[PDB]
Amino acid sequence: PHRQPLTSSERIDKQIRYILDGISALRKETNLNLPKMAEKDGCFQSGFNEETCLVKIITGLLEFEVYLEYLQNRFESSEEQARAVQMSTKVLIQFLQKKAPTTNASLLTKLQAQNQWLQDMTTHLILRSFKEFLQSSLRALRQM
Amino acid sequence: RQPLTSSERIDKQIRYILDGISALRKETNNLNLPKMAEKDGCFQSGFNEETCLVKIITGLLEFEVYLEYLQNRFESSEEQARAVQMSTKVLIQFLQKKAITTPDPTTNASLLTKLQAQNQWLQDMTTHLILRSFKEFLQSSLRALRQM
DNA sequence: GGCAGGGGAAACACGAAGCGGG
DNA sequence: GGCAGGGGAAACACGAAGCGGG
Ligand code: NA
Ligand code: NA
């Protein structure tokens, strides 16, 4: 019998690492107001805040789900992987909730009716803003 | 592993799907579901490879929107529904190479969005009869192909 | 649950190597 | 492509036993 039973932080930490790896295996296999961390949210060392930041992470991740749904009908060569980023994020959003809709429908169909040049631009910068957001989340969480 | 013919891939592709349905169906009237009839030509008499073949494709194209409806009907088996759905996508392609009637890409949604507005018993019934038809349909397709 | 939680892991100027059905 | 194609198989009245990443 082999697996060490983990605490909340370890579990959450491992999950983000799981997601960052996945995303990167989509970065290799490849108007916009995407969530970027701010100092007022209290996730950086300057003006740090364990309460305010956790709210920004859960709020943020939740706002990324639609843009993750977007990425699904975008990777016709890496389908299951792009799904595994979608579900792992959901999974992540549930680990961060222990510790503590048609606007989407419309803005999906806007992104999804742009030309390929625009759609691959959207893809590119979604993935990079997801990476930004996760890395700095892993960092903040490596404290509280 | 050893290699197989195009016909012996189709036969396995169906068998694979039929076992992924038996698994689904274990956990979980006014509709219009694809149903083999004498007119199709998939039976020992009144038989015809061409028409039978066409209807096997056609009927499987018709089923797709209903399998998409299945995804949410197995929240506690999301991948089993998905395998079944995408393993059917493949089957169609295989069949299409061995070769049509494709329903509108805008009428299938009105049905899908409506189905989802039924109370939880009608969904339960709708689910049990999607599987039943689809199984019987694939049961007949297999037998027919094991002849032509 | 169970064999067990909720189908399946140090070096480059700091940005490739290497543990599981119903 | 490669190691190969296009991420991963008898016995009950006819309806359980048990094979591989980029
Ligand atoms: Na398990
Ligand atoms: Na389980």
Author numbering:
A (entry chain A): 14 to 43, 61 to 130, 141 to 184
B (entry chain C): 16 to 43, 60 to 130, 136 to 184
From the paper:
Interleukin-6 (IL-6) is a major contributor to the progression of many chronic inflammatory diseases and a well-established target for pharmacologic intervention. Mammalian IL-6 is a secreted cytokine that exerts its biologic effects through binding to two cell surface receptors, IL-6Rα and gp130 (3–5). The co-crystal structure reveals a large binding interface characterized by extensive shape complementarity between the binding partners in which the SOMAmer engages IL-6 through two distinct domains, a stem-loop domain and a G-quartet domain. The SOMAmer·IL-6 binding interface overlaps with the contact zones between IL-6 and its two cell surface receptors, IL-6Rα and gp130, thereby providing a compelling rationale for the potent inhibitory activity of the SOMAmer against IL-6-mediated signaling.
The two structures are very similar overall and could be assigned to space group P32. Both form 1 and form 2 structures lack the first 13–15 residues of the unstructured N terminus of IL-6 as well as residues in loop regions connecting the helices (form 1 amino acids 48–60; form 2 chain A amino acids 44–60, and chain C amino acids 44–59) and at the C terminus (amino acids 131–135 in form 1 and amino acids 131–140 in form 2 chain A and amino acids 131–135 in chain C). Because the form 1 and form 2 structures are nearly identical, the analysis reported here was done using the more complete IL-6·SOMAmer structure in form 2, specifically chains A and B. The IL-6·SOMAmer complex composed of chains A (IL-6) and B (SOMAmer) is shown in Fig. 1A. The SOMAmer interacts with the N- and C-terminal poles of the IL-6 four-helix bundle, wrapping around the protein perpendicularly to the long axis of the helices. Each G-tetrad is coordinated by a presumed sodium ion that sits in the plane of the tetrad.
